[PDB]
Amino acid sequence: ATYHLEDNWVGSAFLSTFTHEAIADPTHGRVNYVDQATALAKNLTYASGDTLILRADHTTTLSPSGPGRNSVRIRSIKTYTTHVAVFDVRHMPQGCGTWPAAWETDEGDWPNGGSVDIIEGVNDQSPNAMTLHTGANCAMPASRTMTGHATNNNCDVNTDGNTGCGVQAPTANSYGPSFNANGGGWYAMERTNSFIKVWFFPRNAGNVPNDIASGPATINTDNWGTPTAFFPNTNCDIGSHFDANNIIINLTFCGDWAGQASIFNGAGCPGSCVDYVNNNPSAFANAYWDIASVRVYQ
Ligand SMILES: *[C@@H]1O[C@H](CO)[C@@H](O[C@@H]2O[C@H](CO)[C@@H](O[C@@H]3O[C@H](CO[C@H]4O[C@H](CO[C@H]5O[C@H](CO)[C@@H](O)[C@H](O)[C@@H]5O[C@H]5O[C@H](CO)[C@@H](O)[C@H](O)[C@@H]5O)[C@@H](O)[C@H](O[C@H]5O[C@H](CO)[C@@H](O)[C@H](O)[C@@H]5O)[C@@H]4O)[C@@H](O)[C@H](O)[C@@H]3O)[C@H](O)[C@H]2NC(C)=O)[C@H](O)[C@H]1NC(C)=O
Ligand SMILES: OC[C@H]1O[C@@H](O[C@@H]2[C@@H](O)[C@H](O[C@@H]3[C@@H](O)[C@H](O[C@@H]4[C@@H](O)[C@H](O[C@@H]5[C@@H](O)[C@H](O[C@@H]6[C@@H](O)[C@H](O[C@@H]7[C@@H](O)[C@H](O)O[C@H](CO)[C@H]7O)O[C@H](CO)[C@H]6O)O[C@H](CO)[C@H]5O)O[C@H](CO)[C@H]4O)O[C@H](CO)[C@H]3O)O[C@H](CO)[C@H]2O)[C@H](O)[C@@H](O)[C@@H]1O
């Protein structure tokens, strides 16, 4: 459970170690993902000092026939197998219609190379969800040691209605406006051949491991307490469902999850998601990631 620093990304480092994906949104959201040059010119990405900001356009009223709201999706150039990734996050996007995520995948063969969602949610609805999506023959036991609560236990995209196998974090400040009011926190994910684990520590936690908070060169996960989400190999050969994955951090709007009427209105958001996203630019002023660092250990 001992790992050593492999990548340390802070500030402007993200501009050379990640790319921006200017792609049609695979989740069909009301978004226009821009390239790196466009994002930097429009200040949708800001990467300087000890800060990376990734944000949505919060000024344009969209043309209903035109593209969706400008935003960004960044992807690590490097890929990882057995590793730990630690995200020191000061702020995550909020607002009705938002669907932010920090996750890992191999886009080239999805879902067969796996995806693991470390931070994800929709429409300001706490708590955070940590979820795997795989091909066939991957499920999770009903009971396993973790602080969060399992919802769906079948990870196979094809037989699970694309829900994946997910765990809900136990505290509201794991996500959304609650997380932002508290100054964010740290998310760490350990992936091995035998399991995936995710830990959340709030910014003000008296028990955050120094491993996580101070980002030294060596870490030991045996000292981190019980994970928030645990995906053991009891009913899933983890290593055979995941290959080398990139880290992705993005913000979409509406789309296949957040944009469902039942879900959007369920969250207390008014009207249709697309109409809201088109017509309320100001409401996205807080639709930004503010990331202090991302570090990977191997
Ligand atoms: C494109 O978009 C970018 C991003 O939005 C725009 O940049 C912003 O521009 C505006 C306008 O110029 C800036 O607003 C000004 O900020 C002045 C103060 O800035 C300084 O402090 C900021 C807050 O620092 C504290 O909080 C953070 C955590 O959030 C800590 O990391 C930090 O250590 C500080 O902690 C102290 O305070 C807390 C409590 O609040 C205590 O608990 C701590 O112990 C400390 O006491 C900070 O964000 C700023 O950092 C920026 O600049 C430094 C270099 O100077 C760099 O290293 C950072 O990476 C970062 O870039 C800075 O230190 C304020 O006095 C003034 O009135 C005004 O509000 C704003 O700072 C900019 N934001 C950022 C992230 O840079 C940019 O303008 C835009 N381009 C356009 C539109 O043209
Ligand atoms: O539970 C948490 C979990 O929720 C998931 O949403 C589920 C939602 O999809 C579902 O709505 C379905 C709806 O999906 C269906 O439309 C079908 C289209 O989905 C489909 O297009 C797929 C296409 O999506 C896929 O692209 C892959 C992406 O899905 C994937 O997205 C990432 C997630 O896997 C990851 O968990 O999180 C990140 C960050 O948020 C996501 O971006 O990224 C891959 C890599 O980039 C990408 O390949 O490709 C496949 C194959 O190529 C394609 O099939 O198109 C079909 C038409 O062929 C269409 O039917 O429609 C139904 C009916 O209306 C609708 O119910 O509802 C579930 C229950 O609410 C909901 O859980 C999120 O996607 C997860 O992110 C989240 O973890």
Distance from the CA of 48 to the center of ligand 1, in angstroms?
11
134 neighbors 241 (Cβ within 8 angstroms): yes
Please name the amino acid found at residue 179. Answer: F
Return the ligand 2 atom nearest residue 152 CA: 1
**Where do the domains of the chain lie?**
1-298
Nearest CA to ligand 1 atom 27: 90
Mutate to test the pocket of ligand 1, among 48, 58, 180 (most ligand atoms within 8 A of CB): 48
CA distance 157 to 133: 6
Cα distances from 52 to residues 39, 122, 200, in angstroms, run: 12, 22, 20
Q: Determine if the peptide bond prior to 127 is cis (ω within 30°).
A: yes
- 1-298, what's its fold? Jelly Rolls (2.60.120)
Q: Give 224-276 as a DSSP string.
A: S-S-SEEEESTEE-HHHH--SBEEEEEEEESHHHHT-HHHHHHTT--S-HHHH
Instruction: Supply angle C-alpha 99, 101, 106, rounded to 5.
Output: 125
131 neighbors 121 (Cβ within 8 angstroms): no
Distance from the CA of 4 to the center of ligand 2, in angstroms?
34
Q: Which residue has the tokens 């026939």?
A: 65
Nearest to residue 197, comparing CAs of 182, 212, 184? Answer: 212
Bridge partners of residue 191, in order along the sequence: 83, 196
Pocket of ligand 2 (CB under 6 A): 26-27, 101, 103, 105, 107, 110, 115, 117, 120, 129, 131, 133, 161-164, 166, 256-257
Experimental method: X-ray
CA distance 228 to 170: 8
Instruction: Supply angle C-alpha 106, 3, 149, rounded to 5.
Output: 65
Distance from the CA of 57 to the center of ligand 2, in angstroms?
24
In angstroms, how far is the first alpha carbon of the chain from the final one? 10
Number of Cβ within 10 Å of residue 7's Cβ equals 18
